Ligand binder design. Structure first.
Ligand code: HEM
Ligand SMILES: *[C@H]1O[C@H](CO)[C@@H](O[C@@H]2O[C@H](CO)[C@@H](O[C@H]3O[C@H](CO)[C@@H](O)[C@H](O)[C@@H]3O)[C@H](O)[C@H]2NC(C)=O)[C@H](O)[C@H]1NC(C)=O
Ligand SMILES: *[C@H]1O[C@H](CO)[C@@H](O[C@@H]2O[C@H](CO)[C@@H](O[C@H]3O[C@H](CO)[C@@H](O)[C@H](O)[C@@H]3O)[C@H](O)[C@H]2NC(C)=O)[C@H](O)[C@H]1NC(C)=O
Ligand SMILES: *[C@@H]1O[C@H](CO)[C@@H](O[C@@H]2O[C@H](CO)[C@@H](O)[C@H](O)[C@H]2NC(C)=O)[C@H](O)[C@H]1NC(C)=O
Ligand SMILES: *[C@@H]1O[C@H](CO)[C@@H](O[C@@H]2O[C@H](CO)[C@@H](O)[C@H](O)[C@H]2NC(C)=O)[C@H](O)[C@H]1NC(C)=O
Ligand SMILES: [Ca+2]
Length: 595
């Protein structure tokens, strides 16, 4: 039942038995087997990959290979017939801030990235795909239905190259195909610091001995810092406005500047790392660079662990939260670190949470400027709206005071993402995140919805009437059925996101199971977990759960009016309060009095 050890695309170099902070790459968290959770290793399989040829082809690849006696529908038809909607009225989430969506994507990026297969960038690999719409090797183009307005206006297809798979990249052939996770399965801030050695320290300020990350030198935000600029041309943040020529940011994670709000979130994270490094030299004048770096990094990771598990997860998981993440009993080391392949698809529930616009608010939380509210599709890899139009205070206020979108079975993904997405190399604001999501479950060889329901010990439908009952929705089920003929063929992605949301959560059963199980695991199998006895000192620990995303906002921006609960729905004058009625992270318990 096999496959014992294909551990090729990694340099072997072995461990350090203390090295008091994690390794940048996540290796050595686990002692018995070293790799478990290391970046650039293969996403785990909770179930046998399901492919056309049982090996590598994605269902929907060859015309005449039915999946269970039926042809699978095009991702874009699944998209145009179920996922989109016209009316953005009544779509907001009365009880979740824009920050709710923001943190998700953030946490998302810390745990998993399945990079596109490069396999040649001085090739037609590119032209043959978008330009001529030919399917081949890694060019798995998203074809249009007919009746699809994009026919009359963009062409015959959208681009979609398959994902990086392991062992080589060069073409395999004899047992299953496994995509890679290019970040550390651990919730460890890899998004700020890096997941490769190489990138850790380009992000670092080695030039001086204090322990901070390189901050921008071309530009400032009040007295505050800006992530360091990114090196590579072609740069997409340069492509939306060729006139402004402001490049994308440089961070531990590569997708940082997807949109203005994540870049923004990413900026709060760096300042906090530098902030943590001054207080420390201050207190421990003798500790060297490395030490204020790993110990900052060390607090920063802990911080991200508590907001996510103490503030975010109970509000995504809702009632399903204890059932999979009963409280902390400490490090089990048999537990698996590895982000699972399906998690990478389950976590994209967040796509239903992005609204169609973003705002900039001023000190009384009102339209900062004339053109303050903007269409999301004008913010993709848009960095200039930050350094040349107001800094991040304005945007953090929108994060604090606007609302997320709410999944609606009749309004799944907003057209800013569904018909107008921008993709780093394809010049038009014309793509679709829904179609792409669907083409990819197949690319990753996902098992259908019922395999996953079975797996979660959930009932599995086989008829319209059955599918209806579970989705508590009749025409959704009727549409779903007409495209798929059997719920067995439904792509895990839309399949899981069509299920009503649980009590007090924001995802359904299927997803709460898949989600819950993963996080339970990245926490229990994490050797550097902040509660993990010994990992922290006890006061150092009483200092920590006093941390808050509201306080994160004060220490690092000139926003002096915050909400006690950053993720809940918050309106200004009212749910706001000055920053001084706020819990600070007191660092006197880190004080080394080696004198
Ligand atoms: C405006 C905001 C966002 C945009 C424009 C966006 C767009 C995209 C795109 C194009 C992909 C490509 C994946 C593929 O091709 O298969 C992706 C993946 C993903 N996004 Fe979205 N996303 C956004 C927000 C979020 C948020 C807010 C979350 C979490 C709460 C999130 C979680 C993910 C995850 C988990 C993936 C798969 C990452 C992997 O490979 O491990 N994203 N996003
Ligand atoms: C890409 O960024 C450009 C450069 O920042 C941007 O132009 C700048 O933004 C607007 C253009 O409409 C102007 O803003 C306003 O400035 C003050 C108050 O903001 C007003 O009194 C002005 O009349 C003007 O409306 C900036 O002056 C302008 N700067 C420059 C050098 O053009 C472009 O709009 C962006 N291009 C695209 C395609 O997005
Ligand atoms: C909808 O969203 C609110 C969250 O943004 C939601 O609030 C959460 O509801 C639970 C149960 O009412 C409350 O529980 C927390 O407080 C109790 C107090 O005894 C503590 O023992 C627990 O630790 C628990 O965390 C919370 O007040 C809240 N949870 C948190 C962490 O904030 C509201 O029901 C709705 N909001 C509105 C505006 O109606
Ligand atoms: C590494 O840290 C030092 C200290 O902040 C940076 O040098 C400072 O640069 C700012 C202005 O750019 C001024 O405060 C001084 O010129 C320097 N201050 C001190 C206290 O030395 C150095 O440039 C940093 N490098 C990066 C990329 O962040
Ligand atoms: C450590 O994690 C492992 C793997 O997740 C757990 O293994 C369980 O242990 C039971 C004991 O009878 C085995 O039969 C099964 O393989 C697993 N069953 C269940 C329900 O988990 C184990 O529970 C964990 N150990 C600790 C100390 O938490
Ligand atoms: Ca990580």
């Amino acid at each position: 039942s096999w496959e014992v050890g294909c551990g090729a695309p990694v340099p072997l170099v072995k461990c350090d038995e203390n090295s008091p902070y994690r390794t940048i790459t996540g290796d050595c968290n686990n002692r018995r087997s070293p790799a478990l959770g290391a970046a650039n290793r293969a996403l785990a399989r909770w179930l046998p990959a399901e492919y056309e040829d049982g090996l590598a082809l994605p269902f929907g690849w060859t015309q005449r290979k039915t999946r269970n006696g039926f042809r699978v529908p095009l991702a874009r038809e699944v998209s145009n017939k179920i996922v989109g909607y016209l009316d953005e009225e009544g779509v907001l989430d009365q009880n979740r801030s824009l920050l709710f969506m923001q943190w998700g994507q953030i946490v998302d990026h810390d745990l998993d990235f399945a990079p596109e297969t490069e396999l040649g960038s001085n090739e037609h690999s590119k032209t043959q795909c978008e330009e001529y719409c030919i399917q081949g090797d890694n060019c798995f183009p998203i074809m249009f239905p007919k009746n699809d307005p994009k026919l009359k206006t963009q062409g015959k297809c959208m681009p979609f190259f398959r994902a990086g798979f392991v062992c080589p990249t060069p073409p395999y052939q004899s047992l299953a195909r496994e995509q890679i996770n290019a970040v550390t399965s651990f919730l460890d801030a890899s998004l700020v610091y890096g997941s490769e050695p190489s990138l850790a320290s380009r992000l670092r300020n080695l030039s001086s001995p204090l322990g901070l990350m390189a901050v921008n030198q071309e530009a400032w935000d009040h007295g505050l810092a800006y992530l360091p600029f990114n090196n590579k041309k072609p740069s997409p943040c340069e492509f939306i406005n060729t006139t402004a020529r402001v490049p994308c940011f440089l961070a531990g994670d590569f997708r940082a500047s997807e949109q203005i709000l994540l870049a923004t979130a990413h900026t709060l994270l760096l300042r906090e790392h530098n902030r943590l490094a001054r207080e420390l030299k201050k207190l421990n004048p003798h500790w060297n660079g490395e030490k204020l770096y790993q110990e900052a990094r060390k607090i920063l990771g802990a911080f991200i662990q508590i907001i996510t598990f103490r503030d975010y997860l109970p509000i995504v998981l809702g009632s399903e939260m204890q059932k999979w993440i009963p409280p902390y009993q400490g490090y089990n080391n048999s537990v698996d670190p590895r982000i699972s392949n399906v998690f990478t698809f389950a976590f994209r529930f967040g796509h239903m949470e992005v609204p169609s616009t973003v705002s900039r608010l001023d000190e009384n939380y009102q339209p900062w400027g004339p053109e303050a509210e903007l269409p999301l599709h004008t913010l993709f890899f848009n960095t200039w709206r930050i350094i040349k139009d107001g800094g991040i205070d304005p945007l953090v206020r929108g994060l604090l005071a606007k609302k997320s979108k709410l999944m609606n079975q009749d309004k799944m993904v907003t057209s800013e993402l569904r018909n107008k997405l921008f993709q780093p190399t394809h010049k038009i604001h014309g793509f679709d995140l829904a179609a792409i999501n669907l083409q990819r479950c197949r690319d990753h060889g996902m098992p259908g919805y019922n395999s996953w329901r079975g797996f979660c010990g959930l009932s599995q439908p086989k008829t319209l009437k059955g599918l209806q009952t579970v989705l508590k929705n009749k025409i959704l089920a009727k549409k779903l059925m007409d495209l798929y003929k059997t719920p067995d063929n439904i792509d895990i992605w839309i399949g899981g996101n069509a299920e009503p949301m649980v009590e007090r959560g924001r995802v359904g059963p299927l997803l709460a199971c898949l989600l819950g199980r993963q996080f339970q695991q990245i926490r229990d199998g994490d050797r550097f977990w902040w509660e993990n006895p010994g990992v922290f000192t006890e006061k150092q620990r009483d200092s920590l759960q006093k941390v808050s995303f509201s306080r994160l906002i004060c220490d690092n921006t000139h926003i002096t009016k915050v909400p006690l609960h950053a993720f809940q729905a918050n309106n200004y004058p009212h749910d706001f309060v000055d920053c001084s009625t706020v819990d600070k992270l007191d660092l006197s318990p880190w004080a080394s009095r080696e004198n």
